[PDB]
């Protein structure tokens with residue numbers, strides 16, 4: 098009764114499995130329910146069983162990467178709160194506009210929206226905290242470092258987020274329903290991620306910075322290595338560009 | 351006041367912003383599936 | 384055309400500070416970039432880049448390797464200024 | 467009512483391969499040529515099934531990819547033009563985005579198809595280009611905004627300062643997200659593992675090669691022409707050596 | 712007149728790019744199905 102892709106199809110497939118395997122077959126025979134509609138149902142019901150393991154592995158990796166970037170537990174915790182709150186607000190808003198039939202959702206737009214929201218939230222939190230800590234390592238006090246962080250990064254965050262929200266709204270003009278259904282929810286989720294990153298992020302930084310040494314930097318010698326990389330780039334840009342293009346040709350071929 | 355208006359306001363009202371985002375997330379996550 | 388040795392060291396030490404972090408109190412005309420100041424060959428490249436950007440003093444790569452002490456850099460800059 | 471007759475057709479190998487999808491047009495042509503010159507000529511021919519659906523999806527996927535790519539690249543060019551008031555910077559960023567996307571997908575094709583033997587699922591390309599375009603927009607905007615705000619002290623010194631300041635941050639962000647995407651390799655579903663590892667390899671190559679060396683190298687080659695419509699100096703007017711202390 | 716057109720060259724270029732991209736997109740939106 099369904100239509101491959103919809104939920105009525107899985108309704109029907111599981112109902113047929115019930116009807117079939119409800120009564121025992123004669124001895125020496127086995128009965129199966131195949132087809133490219135039971136495969137789709139089993140795939141969509143095992144995908145969300147593997148994604149519950151992925152949801153734990155990705156966070157176990159996020160925490161390690163955060164501890165490696167900031168050699169500190171409190172900074173990693175603060176950034177993780179930023180990211181988790183952005184992701185929660187995004188999921189809540191999109192699920193609200195989909196539950197009240199305001200926008201048209203899908204069980205593919207959701208799995209892509211989680212990824213895009215985590216990416217954008219982590220990026221913006223790293224940008225904000227890194228600019229703040231760089232201004233802090235140059236000597237500026239907490240207030241001056243906060244204002245330097247904002248004036249340097251906020252417009253970048255806004256422009257990049259609005260560009261992503263426009264690019265993943267122009268998917269609404271595609272013809273395949275896979276991509277077509279990504280347009281509105283991904284754009285709305287990007288808008289929510291940007292609003293969160295541009296108001297809640299700076300607010301969390303402005304609150305936590307005025308206690309002890311919470312967001313104070315530790316890895317400032319990495320700036321020196323990256324300055325040496327920039328020196329090598331500005332001194333011998335031609336050879337470095339040749340090497341980079343040669344490396345890119347490996348993949349492009 | 352020699353500071354821009356947007357970050358100055360985000361810094362003055364830092365805790366109401368945090369709490370407002372908190373109740374927004376709470377409502378949006380408990381009143382719908 | 385006679386920027387004094389003190390003036391050149393003063394302008395060079397505030398680039399060495401930004402590149403490395405060594406205070407200008409340590410940048411004296413007899414210190415070795417490798418031994419005393421511990422400035423590798425890739426930090427000297429950006430010292431030279433920023434010197435050229437700020438004061439117009441161009442130091443090529445083949446001549447940058449033969450400047451072992453701060454006094455050597457000051458002497459190079461003065462001899463380049465003399466023309 | 468006898469007005470329609472149907473035939474049930476089976477394939478020899480894999481129906482959902484490239485050959486089983488190319489067979490759909492051949493089946494339709496054979497059916498159309500069998501009724502040519504008969505009293506059934508001019509009848510309507512309908513072909514349904516799984517390989518026909520996937521032939522339609524195959525045709526539509528490339529046009530949807532072209533639409534999304536055109537739209538995203540134009541949006542990226544527009545935001546780079548608005549941020550840096552420069553045609554050359556925007557065009558260079560769009561070109562490096564395209565080149566990085568191509569190189570990343572080629573590396574993923576290598577790893578999966580040629581080394582591991584498993585082909586890439588047909589949705590991996592789209593799901594990868596979306597995420598890669600988004601994160602590349604993020605990181606390129608953050609780098610070139612710092613470049614523009616610091617080239618006032620000289621293009622070379624500006625690039626050095628912008629590297630030391632924002633290259634650290636974009637590298638940290640790219641590495642974090644790349645290693646959280648490459649964690650999908652633990653899934654039983656090979657399509658999820660392929661999407662995750664494609665995005666992860668793409669971000670690794672992007673942040674460690676393209677954005678780390680190729681974009682600032684192009685900014686260093688084209689000294690003042692990187693900002694062409696704006697007239698910038700390669701370096702400021704030389705200052706006199708300062709008074710001691 | 713050039714003095715005022717080279718002041719709004721960014722919005723003009725953005726408009727040209729948007730027009731070209733939109734026409735090409737609405738053209739490609741007709742290839743499927745047919």
Ligand SMILES: CCCCCCCCCCCCCCCCCC(=O)OC[C@H](COP(=O)([O-])OCC(O)COP(=O)([O-])OC[C@@H](COC(=O)CCCCCCCCCCCCCCCCC)OC(=O)CCCCCCCCCCCCCCCCC)OC(=O)CCCCCCCCCCCCCCCCC
Nearest residue numbers: 166319321322323325326329337340649667670671674679
């Ligand atoms: C369940 C399984 C799931 C799997 C995933 C789970 C795994 C989880 C764990 C993952 C483990 C990874 C952990 C990452 C650590 C995070 C580090 C971080 O936060 O970033 C900041 C990090 C800070 O480092 P730090 O430890 O805090 O200390 C700072 C320094 O010590 C400061 O000390 P210093 O001042 O004395 O000098 C050292 C200075 C550096 O000083 C210098 O030496 C200057 C050098 C100037 C260069 C001059 C020549 C330039 C040549 C141009 C040619 C172009 C191409 C060149 C390529 C690079 C050549 C060097 O270092 C720096 O600070 C800047 C380094 C610049 C890095 C640029 C090099 C890019 C590498 C590109 C090659 C990689 C290929 C990518 C393709 C991938 C394909 C998939 O910045 C870095 O230093 C970079 C280190 C790590 C970056 C990535 C390198 C590998 C990491 C993984 C990539 C894996 C790819 C392997 C592919 C294999 C190939 C076949």
Ligand SMILES: CCCCCCCCCCCCCCCCCC(=O)OC[C@H](COP(=O)([O-])OCC(O)COP(=O)([O-])OC[C@@H](COC(=O)CCCCCCCCCCCCCCCCC)OC(=O)CCCCCCCCCCCCCCCCC)OC(=O)CCCCCCCCCCCCCCCCC
Nearest residue numbers: 342554557558560561562564565684687688689691692694
């Ligand atoms: C799927 C497609 C989707 C769309 C694709 C993406 C769409 C966007 C495309 C991206 C566009 C790239 C933007 C480039 C604009 C830069 C030009 C500019 O306005 O700056 C002025 C700049 C003038 O600076 P200057 O000459 O140094 O001024 C003299 C100084 O004042 C004082 O002189 P000096 O004393 O300092 O002497 C030293 C000086 C030399 O001074 C000179 O006098 C040299 C003058 C002679 C050079 C001009 C001859 C050009 C004749 C051929 C023109 C080719 C144009 C191709 C069409 C446009 C590019 C698409 O050294 C240099 O600076 C020359 C090095 C600069 C070029 C290095 C590479 C930077 C270009 C960026 C591309 C990176 C290459 C990656 C490789 C990719 C591999 C796949 O123009 C140039 O002369 C540089 C030439 C740039 C070469 C462009 C090659 C691009 C290769 C990619 C093409 C792919 C297209 C394929 C399309 C699809 C086909 C299937």
Ligand SMILES: CCCCCCCCCCCCCCCCCC(=O)O[C@@H](COC(=O)CCCCCCCCCCCCCCC)COP(=O)(O)OCCN
Nearest residue numbers: 248251252255256259260262263266284291292295356549
């Ligand atoms: C689907 C809906 C979305 C569709 C959108 C389509 C595409 C729209 C493209 C969006 C372009 C937005 C451009 C804004 C950033 C452009 C960068 C720029 O213009 O550069 C200047 C940026 O100038 C600006 O400041 C522009 C104003 C941005 C301020 C950011 C304030 C953020 C507001 C916080 C609340 C966020 C809530 C927004 C919710 C979406 C340079 O300024 P500066 O370096 O001297 O330093 C700036 C700070 N002192």
Ligand SMILES: CCCCCCCCCCCCCCCCCC(=O)O[C@@H](COC(=O)CCCCCCCCCCCCCCC)COP(=O)(O)OCCN
Nearest residue numbers: 539540543551553557560695696716717718720721724728
């Ligand atoms: C993937 C999508 C990409 C699509 C994008 C296509 C890219 C096409 C690029 C077309 C370049 C046209 C740029 C127009 C030139 C603007 C320069 C100008 O008119 O004014 C400048 C004045 O400088 C000049 O005098 C130069 C005048 C010569 C301009 C001649 C136009 C050259 C056209 C280049 C052709 C390249 C076309 C490539 C097509 C693929 C600066 O004025 P301003 O400082 O007051 O404004 C800046 C503050 N916002």
Ligand SMILES: *P(=O)(O)OCC(C)(C)[C@H](O)C(=O)NCCC(=O)NCCS
Nearest residue numbers: 329333336337340423424425428444448
């Ligand atoms: P230092 O003794 O470690 O020397 C470092 C430098 C990088 C100065 C090097 O030996 C050198 O002098 N020339 C090599 C040029 C070069 O590095 N080009 C870019 C790499 S492709």
